Design a protein around this ligand. Sequence first.
Ligand SMILES: CCCCCCCCCCCC(=O)OC[C@H](COP(=O)([O-])O)OC(=O)CCCCCCCCCCC
Ligand SMILES: *C/C=C(C)/C=C/C=C(C)/C=C/C1=C(C)CCCC1(C)C
Ligand SMILES: *C/C=C(C)/C=C/C=C(C)/C=C/C1=C(C)CCCC1(C)C
Ligand SMILES: CCCCCCCCCCCCCCCC(=O)O
Ligand SMILES: CCCCCCCCCCCCCCCC(=O)O
Ligand SMILES: CCCCCCCCCCCCCCCC(=O)O
Lengths: 253, 253, 111, 111
Amino acid sequence: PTVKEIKSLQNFNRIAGVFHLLQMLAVLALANDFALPMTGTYLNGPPGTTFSAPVVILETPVGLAVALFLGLSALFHFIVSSGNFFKRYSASLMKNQNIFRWVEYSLSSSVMIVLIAQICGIADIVALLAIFGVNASMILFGWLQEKYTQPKDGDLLPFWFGCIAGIVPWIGLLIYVIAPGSTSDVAVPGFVYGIIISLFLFFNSFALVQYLQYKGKGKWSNYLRGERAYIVLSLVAKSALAWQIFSGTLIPA
Amino acid sequence: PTVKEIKSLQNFNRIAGVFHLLQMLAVLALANDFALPMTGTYLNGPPGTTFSAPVVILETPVGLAVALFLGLSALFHFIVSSGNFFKRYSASLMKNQNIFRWVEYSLSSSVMIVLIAQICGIADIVALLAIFGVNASMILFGWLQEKYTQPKDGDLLPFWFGCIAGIVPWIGLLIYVIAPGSTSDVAVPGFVYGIIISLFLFFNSFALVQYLQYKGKGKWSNYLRGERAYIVLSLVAKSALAWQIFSGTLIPA
Amino acid sequence: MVQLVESGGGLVQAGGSLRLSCAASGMAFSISRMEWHRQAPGNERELVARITGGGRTTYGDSVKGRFTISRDNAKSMVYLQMNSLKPEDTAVYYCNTGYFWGQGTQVTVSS
Amino acid sequence: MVQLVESGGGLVQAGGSLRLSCAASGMAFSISRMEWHRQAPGNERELVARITGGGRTTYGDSVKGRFTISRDNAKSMVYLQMNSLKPEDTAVYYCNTGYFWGQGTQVTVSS
Ligand SMILES: CCCCCCCCCCCC(=O)OC[C@H](COP(=O)([O-])O)OC(=O)CCCCCCCCCCC
Ligand SMILES: *C/C=C(C)/C=C/C=C(C)/C=C/C1=C(C)CCCC1(C)C
Ligand SMILES: *C/C=C(C)/C=C/C=C(C)/C=C/C1=C(C)CCCC1(C)C
Ligand SMILES: CCCCCCCCCCCCCCCC(=O)O
Ligand SMILES: CCCCCCCCCCCCCCCC(=O)O
Ligand SMILES: CCCCCCCCCCCCCCCC(=O)O
């Protein structure tokens, strides 16, 4: 990695940040008022005898959440292209690691997965909190893998740990989509299936990019290819998800 | 570490395993038939419009779960004191790491925390599955910390990550104990408070032992002290929990 | 099966006031969202109120400052209070949820 | 408030059979566990059946092979079927939950 290659990333990051900011502003300006509940069912006696009717504790608005997980990326991409921050960024890239990315992801991906789970029909607060925790744990495992190992040496243990700890939310989503034991006759709409399938494919793409970067082939021996891939996939995923919720839920107003 | 110190651990582990086996047999022989439900509340229309009454999907018996998380430890403590397995065990202890312990814990602690959460009044299946995932992630973080770092060098990052990823279930338990937004007039019993407080203290004890082992003082520079502490605390925790559930829930028969 | 049954309505004068009631059936009433719809004899349909099952309330921008929707749990009741009527609200009102409609009621306002 | 109301009972012969019914109130009936208790005029109390809200059934080891408890969701009903009675079951029966009792009913068996 020479000076010019690290120099172009300034303009690359600036362009990404501008795109994110414009999309956030449009979504804030056009969305209507929609909300989804967080509930809870309490006991009314001994530990396993009698329950009570569910009640609503909180209500999430959707437009603000979408604007939130776009604004986070916009803010971070503008921070990286700053002054002394860029000096530390280049110094860390020279050492084959990046820290800003994981700090961004551990919040953005968690918000995404919470919203996706909430649309499918999950309302308990503890379920959402634990899903948040699981996703953050997966990202931290990726951070540890990047920090403690070296390319082409054949050690891939934290990668496998992160793969193990990132499949639980999708098992839960599958369970609520199959819906065992229910008594109903209303079928799931189509945009739910579209959202689920598309986001699963994007998550698989992120994992594959990590694996190919640390395998060390004859072409992927350069770190900047993986850096560019991580920027582009992040720019695509956010836009692919934010405009599927808007068209179908937030539009009739 | 010399030969005799590694030799005494054979008898130590055998004694621990025998104690676990006897307690498991007693609990199996004396318990009655008690069960707790796993439920689910599904939609009946568009994503955020109409719900349905909750239904019961599964039912956990309690005596079998208690026997399970005692039998796991019994089996592992008998495996370690075997033949060639003991050779690999001693070889790994010479290198300042142990693997059998984490393989045991990642199941035993998860079963414990699922049961503790279920007693407090949590019934959703996704909540229990995600709690399982979070606890396993914490144990795996401990494994990575032990594998990739060295005592007295001042690096404690995976320890902090494991501390971060192990506080979510207790936040959920606190939320269902405070019970915000409910309409009820029945107070929580006392053994619930006893169980919660005791198990929180024991988990803090485990974390403290890890931290003191890897700080490297003038007295804790020997690894076998930490090994013995991990055996004793595990032998106490299981017995402290299995006989508080039995006396109060499973006894009147 | 979900059954919504509403009552009230009738014929009143210009300055009168009404209280329509809707009673629900075997669903989870403390979470689900209820709605009130209006159809005039000769138009397509409109929207009157929503209650979102949590407390928040939205209207149809043509009845603001005149109507008030409220709900009562532990009895499964939805109440609509109409005050300061006008001689154009002659219509049929429906109680609504996630497309489980009910047999509407007639409201008539004289001169 | 939780209100349990049961009906049935009365006076029968030795070989008769009965069907007692219990109706529940504002709780979550599809999860909670319901019980049937018996008190004889002169004894303390006993246990008759449990239904655990999921399907499983346990009895009191003195009425096995004679009684049968069942539940019906979507109407909140608990049914107890008594067959092949004996001239000792003269008693008062109560419908029970997590200590929310109800006003029992009388069962009498003649010779
Ligand atoms: C919640 C709102 C505030 C969040 C701010 C979190 C980031 C704060 C800036 C941290 C930047 C930093 O330099 O990291 C500090 C060190 C990193 O050490 P190292 O990787 O250079 O060896 O050690 C650490 O990284 C500390 C570990 C904790 C930071 C990761 C936070 C993950 C949040 C998970 C939410 C569930
Ligand atoms: C908005 C950005 C998002 C949603 C990025 C998500 C990234 C992932 C889901 C990738 C996670 C990884 C694995 C699945 C295993 C460990 C390595 C990671 C972190 C790249
Ligand atoms: C039956 C054995 C049990 C419950 C052991 C549980 C162990 C822990 C809760 C300890 C976890 C640790 C931390 C809290 C941080 C990371 C290091 C660990 C794994 C020792
Ligand atoms: C831990 C990963 C695997 C978890 C598997 C959990 C399976 C839950 C769903 C099983 C339900 C089987 C059918 C239940 C009985 C019924 O039909 O009502
Ligand atoms: C503590 C819960 C964690 C799971 C570990 C307990 C193992 C049992 C889990 C439920 C299995 C249910 C088996 C039902 C068998 C039957 O049909 O009677
Ligand atoms: C992510 C860690 C912090 C999580 C904090 C979650 C707080 C949930 C409980 C807040 C309820 C506040 C009161 C709700 C309004 C009411 O009284 O009904």
